[PDB]
Amino acid sequence: MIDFGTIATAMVTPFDINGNIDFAKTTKLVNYLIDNGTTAIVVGGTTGESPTLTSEEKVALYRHVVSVVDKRVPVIAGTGSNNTHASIDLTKKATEVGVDAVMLVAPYYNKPSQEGMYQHFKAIAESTPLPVMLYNVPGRSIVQISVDTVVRLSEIENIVAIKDAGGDVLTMTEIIEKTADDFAVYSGDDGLTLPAMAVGAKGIVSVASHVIGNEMQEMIAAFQAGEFKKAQKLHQLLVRVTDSLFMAPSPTPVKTALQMVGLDVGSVRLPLLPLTEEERVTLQSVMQSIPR
Template sequence: MTLLSSDTKGVFAISVTPFDDQGAIDFDSLDRATDFYLEKGSTGITVLGMMGEAPKMVQSEAVTIAERVIKRANGAPIVVGVSAPGLAAVAELSKKAMDLGAAGVMIAPPGNLKTNEQIIAYYGNACEAAGAGVPVVLQDFPHTTGVNISTDTLNTILAQNEQIVMLKHEDWPGLEKVTAVREAEKGGRRPISILCGNGALFLPEAMARGANGAMTGFAYIEMLRDVVAYAEKGDIDRAQDIYDAYLPLVCYEQQPGLGLAVRKYVLQKRGVIASEAMRKPGKGLTAAAKAEVDRIIARQEKRLKELG
């Protein structure tokens, strides 16, 4: 079992959770999605993230999904989202995930945290709940959680909790935070891995600032793989050219409340999942929106051929 570390880099696809039209988990599609992510170049997979509709599941379903993907991935590192309002749920799912062979767990802050002191205390307690030595990914996604973690607070949390080995960076605007975290390392704070979410928005810029890769569910893993690879080689111009071909779809996904519907529609079009269905509350795209996505993808494919 490969555990996450501060040296982890590459692409971790945030997996969708496929459902049938009645809202039951479609495990055949989940298997295909796992294979798809890895075949297209994902270093690992993250399950039960916010885009995996984790809040819509009971604990037993979450455990079953984690087990299924870990077994299917055949040794590739799997991160399990264990975010929950209460620490007891974090502790229970963390233990089960790690016993199943997860590479680490991801924890976002609950929305009731209002002060820096509360945020710092929470992550100390959350790391304890996850279990000694369990690698933790800190998900910094204020636009969804409502919790704004300042750079100073973040650096304090990282200094106090060595098992936090990775930052899932989703603050927006947040490029200055990437720079500040790296500057703190130059000042003596231990290094961590930084993987970027937010649907890959600003990925080339974040890589140039010192990020180590991407952790997001954008349906074209090929883009994430290639942008990260070229950026790591120092060829930011080539990374940007590839990224720009996909940028209209990246931007379209940023519409509030629409991103997951777009993602599932694209994955269904690509033959990965059988249905674009989401669990209620949640609905798919209208016919007009699907036509817009189809047009964006057609232009994307044309541009990629031009780029070679």
């Protein structure tokens, strides 16, 4: 059974001055994340700006990350969209370039039923030997993958995990209870890392780990040890930092926070925009508040 560990990081896609994928900065960010508590890398997720990458950018980004990671941590490619056939296609291409797993988002915009989503995820899972991580995100796709739906899908052999960004640790709980023990439930919301884990989540698919990966690993280890007060103080920092990373449409704030800590990964592609001066000042304060 593939193990993504306790912190999968949904990596940003570094862009150069022309907005193209900056491959050399990508290498640098990949090694930095692996050195700072990242235990698996989700490439070309929401946070990697999957909406504005082309299919061929995605494939090349996947290829390059696989090569740089060199099997040090699992590489999960965000291949699902709201088009089942295009999702199968991009999943085949990801597999061909050696990724370890695919992450498949709930179809956004076209609002499929539970049965539609069942068939969509079933057909994408069936097209690859790779492990599949479902990605529940009603705050962007509107629909939710219902508990019953996730459970039906978990019975498929290569559907092994869910990244639940639904904000609800009680639906998480119910998924944990109703699926086999080898079905890994991850939080998809940084601030819920600690409470999700309290109820049995395996960990977090993270954005905040770009800047506080080590603190998050410390938090998690403290909690598992029963060191509640130490875990709570770090949870407080996690929640505060997470809030500042979503003051504006993600991933611009985290791309900006990274620039502020010495790791320039470029800007973002339209329709996302650079932070304003005032947004930047607000963010820099929060960044400057992190214990060094």
